[PDB]
Amino acid sequence: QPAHLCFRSFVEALKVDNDLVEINTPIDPNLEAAAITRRVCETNDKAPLFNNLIGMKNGLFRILGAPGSLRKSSADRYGRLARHLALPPTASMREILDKMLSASDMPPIPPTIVPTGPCKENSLDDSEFDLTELPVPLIHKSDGGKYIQTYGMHIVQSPDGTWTNWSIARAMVHDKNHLTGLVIPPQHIWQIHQMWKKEGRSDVPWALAFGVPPAAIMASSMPIPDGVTEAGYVGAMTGSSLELVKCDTNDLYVPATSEIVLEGTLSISETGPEGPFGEMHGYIFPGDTHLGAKYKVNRITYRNNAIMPMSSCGRLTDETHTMIGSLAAAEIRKLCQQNDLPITDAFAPFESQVTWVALRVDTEKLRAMKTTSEGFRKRVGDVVFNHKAGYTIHRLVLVGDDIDVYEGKDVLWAFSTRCRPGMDETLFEDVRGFPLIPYMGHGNGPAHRGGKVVSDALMPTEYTTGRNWEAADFNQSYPEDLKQKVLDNWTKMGFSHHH
Amino acid sequence: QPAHLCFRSFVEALKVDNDLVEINTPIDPNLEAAAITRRVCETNDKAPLFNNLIGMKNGLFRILGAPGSLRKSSADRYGRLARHLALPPTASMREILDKMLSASDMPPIPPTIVPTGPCKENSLDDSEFDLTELPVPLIHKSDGGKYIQTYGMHIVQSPDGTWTNWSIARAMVHDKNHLTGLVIPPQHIWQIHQMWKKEGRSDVPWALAFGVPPAAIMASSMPIPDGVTEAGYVGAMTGSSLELVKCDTNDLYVPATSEIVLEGTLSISETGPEGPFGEMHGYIFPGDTHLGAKYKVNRITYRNNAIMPMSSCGRLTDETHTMIGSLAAAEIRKLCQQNDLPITDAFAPFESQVTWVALRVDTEKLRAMKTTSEGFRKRVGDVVFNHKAGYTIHRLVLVGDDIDVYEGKDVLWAFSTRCRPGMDETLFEDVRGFPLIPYMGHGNGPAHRGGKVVSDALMPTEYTTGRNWEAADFNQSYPEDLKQKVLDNWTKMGFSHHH
Ligand SMILES: Cc1cc2c3c(c1C)C(C)(C)CC=[N+]3c1c([nH]c(=O)[nH]c1=O)N2C[C@H](O)[C@H](O)[C@H](O)COP(=O)(O)O
Ligand SMILES: Cc1cc2c3c(c1C)C(C)(C)CC=[N+]3c1c([nH]c(=O)[nH]c1=O)N2C[C@H](O)[C@H](O)[C@H](O)COP(=O)(O)O
Ligand SMILES: [K+]
Ligand SMILES: [K+]
Ligand SMILES: [K+]
Ligand SMILES: [K+]
Ligand SMILES: [Mn+2]
Ligand SMILES: [Mn+2]
């Protein structure tokens, strides 16, 4: 099976790329696996495959850390993400985000039901497993539980059957047969949960599949529109119908090559302690436990020699930055364009801890609109901050065509030099806020509302007659023939891609 | 003579450090020297010494570019600055800024007058020089003149004789015997000029010395207090009285080893076209010429084989970042402390284009103050933004003790995650603004007023009971013994100072 369609093949691809370290000696899931992974993520090293996890039994489980993190070299920096999508390892972020958006104006390709697959190789009924006995990692020393779920896909379906959602939401072990996790607005797992709660008749049929097709985990992490079944979006993106197998204990369908599948129910009534967890913004607040959603596990199925992917999330750079931020930015770009806003590109700078999105403006189109900063900022912020795709993002930075929004140095330059604090900004207090940002949930104001801003780093003439500066840089401050001469003589004089 | 006391010895020090490239073939001062220098500054390469400048005649002049720019390696990143000050090349920014502040609670050591020095080796009277015939560089292609003055020291004295100021302010060639330049409030050259204007009786006696003692050019660039003679501050910092020689045509005193000295007058009545110039924030606005101050040159004296230092300023990183930003930050740190504010450290992040200063707070002291964010931000911003040391800085970021303000990644992390836009900020519209920032002088609001902000990246419990988080990073999220084990086994497992 191709790497983008099969997690086991993806692992092989990483090995073949010299982008994997296999660790065959015993590693403790209590902190050690996650510490190694954390160090990988902070240094852009090779992904760790833990083949010898202390507590592994009857095939459950090995661990792959850092599945969607960065590589060291600039040339293949996003290669691990490219390997989720059948793209060349040198793909740019623009190419990755375009691939993720491509299915948005294509017919879905619905999944294909097959009778069996590798995920059925082994099974454990409700007398034969205990979640507390598996080698579930403790990822950060102050976590409030062992977070089994950091890179699997939750599967829930609307009561009417018409929408099946795939998403990544965290969850930890509660006891032998239950998990607790976040189920919060405006996420689609929450929206579907609310539908079942209003019906009031049963718990939500649920499955959680780990080690799913890489293209599917990417779509899981993306805020594609309400009511759109991710399986058919992934089918259209990849050009192929995804092969799914029915669960044994409910009528949901999971990817045939899933490494590990949990089947059960998400309660419409019960809750349990959840958190704290070391989160995407780089913090944990020890002791901050709150009631979360509660999942009951009735059955486990799994591949021979099953591998559990894990995100050791926190400070830069891991899957929470590369996937949450970038994929939100992609959706925001599309949303802007669909609202007739002249946005060409969007990216969440890593430097902002993916709390900003920089929006590149086609300034020729802007000039035709004959508008002003105040008006334009308000329009952009209303579109984005009133939409689910804007949920995680608290600052939008508008920049003109000279800025590469995929280069954080350039975004920071433009923000710092072109946006006058206060005057060139519009604050949004009556929008949904992202409580996980420390200044929100642990800050001075409402955790769930406000704290958002549009920062206009467009210069005045960008709205009227066109850019009226040149950069004071080597590229712009010297003629072509001179630059080339300098470059050609550089090493001759005495001065100093792949790598 | 030691390197910090003699520019010619400083050049030798750079050579001996393997931090100099001597270019002995012809180089054009029209753009080429500055293009090479620009590329150096953008890549942190070795400083260029142009020994063969097209247009050099009778000893005027060679050029040294990038005298205060960065080195590539982390270990000696600030080594060129350290060489201005007799510090080891591995000195930290903290050590550099402490050295620059050291003279602030020492008695001045006034200069010593000597009868002659190298700066008298050659001379040109007002029948023998023409500024338009010297190899003055065109630094950026759209500059409005040839900017002879980018790293020399202007010398002016109050009418009463009691304050002699040394500073760096730009100036360009106007004609055979005049320069034009910026003389703007609140700079000390402007303050002294105003004194002479109010007296109304003559033009200001002036000298401009290039290739001065490195320790003197550093103090030139620093906003030490009103009324303090830089020569005596430098004497106290270095522990030695600086040797000065009288000008030939006026009674000002210049460093004995100056490479090149211009003597003349700064007019109290006349102006001439000045600018545009490619500036510290990374921009030039072609055609933006305005009237500037006008200097008349009556005499030139110079060393044999004189060397003119040049800053090819613009986008990161050059002397305008390393010196303007850092030295302002140093003075701000002291100002805060003298106003009883619990500030330990200050630095202007390069990422902010040195428009921000991050202020590290001693949070134990803050807690004792029993205050709030709103109150504390206002107090800090009043002290700093009402003072000349705050002139160039438009955003102050308050951070707690865990943040190294000399590391821009950490400042950006804290700003993005701990300061809620709007709520956690105080805007200052009734303070002096820095018009050279594009969003000021070319922006939507008054060029000279407002546009400043205090951004509080202190978390709520930092004011009350103490930090209540741990970072989700390798350092903080794992115990000591584990970290050490991971590190010790890193290369064994398969994973990857001076450089
Ligand atoms: C890649 C990724 C995405 C996480 C995520 C993580 C990763 C690694 C974690 C597991 C390591 C930590 C927490 N995460 C959660 C999360 N969204 C959410 O609601 N709760 C979470 O608890 N997301 C973001 C969520 O997947 C995206 O917002 C999707 O748009 C949600 O899909 P949906 O649009 O169908 O609701
Ligand atoms: C290092 C450095 C400092 C420049 C400077 C440059 C460099 C390289 C340039 C020459 C390349 C470009 C412009 N600069 C000017 C400038 N200050 C100013 O008023 N006008 C300028 O035109 N400064 C900043 C000024 O030197 C500091 O603000 C000092 O505090 C001024 O000394 P003072 O406190 O005694 O007034
Ligand atoms: K999704
Ligand atoms: K603006
Ligand atoms: K000075
Ligand atoms: K704050
Ligand atoms: Mn969805
Ligand atoms: Mn001064």
8 A C-beta contact, residue A5 and residue A118: no
Q: How many residues does chain B have?
A: 499
CA dihedral defined by B87, B90, B93, B98, rounded to 10 degrees? -30
Count Cβ atoms within 10 A of the Cβ of residue A223 and give its class: 0-12 exposed, 13-18 middle, 19 or more buried: buried
Instruction: Report the chain A residue with the minimal C-alpha distance to residue B427.
Output: A422
8 A C-beta contact, residue B278 and residue B243: no
Instruction: Choose one of A330, A350, A374: the last residue of a domain.
Output: A330
Pick the ligand that lies closest to the CA of residue A223.
1
| Torsion angles phi and psi, residue A205, rounded to 5 | -55, 135
8 A C-beta contact, residue B188 and residue B212: no
8 A C-beta contact, residue A101 and residue A344: no
Q: Is the CB of B312 under 6 A from ligand 2?
A: no
* A466/A374 Cα distance (integer angstroms): 18
Can you give A128-186 as a three-state secondary structure string? Answer: CCCHHHCCCCECCCCCCCCCCECCCEEEEECCCCCCEEEECCCEEEEECCEEEECCCCC
| A279 in active site | yes
- A353 interaction partners in chain B (CB closer than 8 Å): 412-413, 416-417
Same domain, B61 and B106: yes
Cβ contact, residue pair A474, B38, below 8 Å:
yes
8 A C-beta contact, residue B165 and residue B207: no
Same domain, B300 and B446: no
Cβ contact, residue pair A421, B452, below 8 Å:
yes
Distance from CA of residue B383 to its chain's centroid?
21
357-376 in B: which are within 8 Å (CB) of A? 373
3-class SS of residue B452: strand
Q: How many CA atoms lie within 13 A of A85 on its CB side?
A: 27
Secondary structure letter of residue B212 according to DSSP: -
8 A C-beta contact, residue B286 and residue B299: no
Residue to mutate among A311, A473, A480, A482, with most B CBs inside 10 A, is: A473
8 A C-beta contact, residue B294 and residue B174: yes
* B298/B293 Cα distance (integer angstroms): 17
- In angstroms, the Cα distances linking B207 to B99, B155, B189 are 27, 5, 12
- In angstroms, the Cα distances linking B496 to A306, B41, B73, B476, B484 are 27, 30, 19, 22, 16
8 A C-beta contact, residue A116 and residue A245: yes
Out of A48, A140, A496, whose CB is closest to B477? Answer: A140
Residue type, position A228, single letter = V
- Ligand 1, pocket residues at CB < 6 Å: A 150-151, 165, 167-170, 182, 184, 187-189, 221-223, 311, 313, 319-320, 323-324
Nearest ligand 1 atom to the CA of A392 is 28
Nearest to residue A266, comparing CAs of A194, A318, A164, A350?
A194
Distance from CA of B160 to the nearest CA of A (A): 40
Same domain, A342 and A474: no
How many helices (H) does chain A have, and how many strands (E)?
14, 22
- B52 interaction partners in chain A (CB closer than 8 Å): none
Residue ranges for the known binding site of B are: 165-170, 187-188, 230, 388
Same domain, A224 and A361: no
Q: A442 CA distance to ligand 1 centroid (A)?
A: 20
Residue to mutate among A477, A480, A484, A486, with most B CBs inside 10 A, is: A477
8 A C-beta contact, residue A151 and residue A67: yes
- A445 interaction partners in chain B (CB closer than 8 Å): 420, 423
Same domain, A475 and A354: no
Positions of E strands within A303-368: 307-310, 343-347, 356-361
Q: Catalytic pick from B259, B263, B279, B425?
A: B279
- A286 interaction partners in chain B (CB closer than 8 Å): 468-470
3-class SS of residue B189: helix
Out of A284, A353, A421, whose CB is closest to B417? Answer: A353
Nearest to residue A240, comparing CAs of A115, A103, A104?
A103
Contact status of B26 with chain A (Cβ, < 8 Å)? no
Secondary structure letter of residue A119 according to DSSP: G
What are the b/e assignments for B103-130, b being 16+ CB within 10 Å? bbeeebbebeeeeebbbbebebeeeebe
* B60/B122 Cα distance (integer angstroms): 10
Q: How many other β-carbons are positioned within 10 Å of the β-carbon of residue A430?
A: 9
- In angstroms, the Cα distances linking A249 to A120, A246, B488 are 13, 9, 47
* A276/A288 Cα distance (integer angstroms): 5
First-to-final CA distance of chain B: 30
* B52/B56 Cα distance (integer angstroms): 7
Residue ranges for the known binding site of A for Mn(2+) are: 165, 188, 230
Same domain, B354 and B302: no
Q: What angle do CA B403, B409, B414 make, to 5 degrees?
A: 50
Q: Is the CB of B34 under 6 A from ligand 2?
A: no
Instruction: Choose one of A311, A330, A349: the last residue of a domain.
Output: A330
* B124/B61 Cα distance (integer angstroms): 14
Nearest ligand 2 atom to the CA of B328 is 30
User: What tokens does A217 get?
Assistant: 């985990």
Same domain, A68 and A215: yes
Out of A42, A471, A485, whose CB is closest to B283? Answer: A471
Strand B395-399 and strand B356-361: the pairing is parallel
Positions of E strands within B158-259: 164-167, 171-175, 178-181, 204-210, 243-246, 253-255
Same domain, B199 and B305: yes
Cβ contact, residue pair A21, B495, below 8 Å:
yes
Residue ranges for the known binding site of A are: 165-170, 187-188, 230, 388
Same domain, B106 and B66: yes
User: What tokens does A52 get?
Assistant: 């010898």
- B452 interaction partners in chain A (CB closer than 8 Å): 421
Domain count, chain B: 3
CA dihedral defined by B97, B99, B100, B105, rounded to 10 degrees? 120
Q: Which residue has the tokens 């709660």?
A: A197
Pick the ligand that lies closest to the CA of residue A163.
7
CA dihedral over B330, B331, B337, B343, signed as positive or negative: negative
* B471/B255 Cα distance (integer angstroms): 51
Cβ contact, residue pair A39, B286, below 8 Å:
no
Radius of gyration of chain B (CA): 23
Same domain, A319 and A434: no
8 A C-beta contact, residue A157 and residue A164: yes
* B398/B336 Cα distance (integer angstroms): 12
User: What tokens does B95 get?
Assistant: 């050590």
Residue type, position B228, single letter = V
Same domain, B108 and B186: yes
Same domain, A269 and A404: no
Instruction: Report the chain A residue with the minimal C-alpha distance to residue B277.
Output: A472
What string of DSSP letters covers B300-338?
Answer: EEE-TT-EEEE---SSSSSHIIIIIIHHHHHHHHHHHHH
Q: How many other β-carbons are positioned within 10 Å of the β-carbon of residue B471?
A: 17
Q: Where are the alpha helices (DSSP H) in B239-387?
A: 319, 326-338, 363-369, 373-385
Instruction: Choose one of B330, B359, B386: the last residue of a domain.
Output: B330
Q: How many other β-carbons are positioned within 10 Å of the β-carbon of residue B357?
A: 29
Q: How many residues does chain A have?
A: 499
- In angstroms, the Cα distances linking A109 to A1, A156, A245, A331, A459 are 19, 19, 16, 20, 44
Q: Catalytic pick from A259, A279, A331, A462?
A: A279
Question: For this experimental structure, what is the resolution in angstroms?
Answer: 1.1
Residues spanned by the domain of A488:
460-499
CA dihedral over A231, A235, A236, A237, signed as positive or negative: positive
Find the helix or strand (DSSP H, E) in which B277 lies. Answer: none
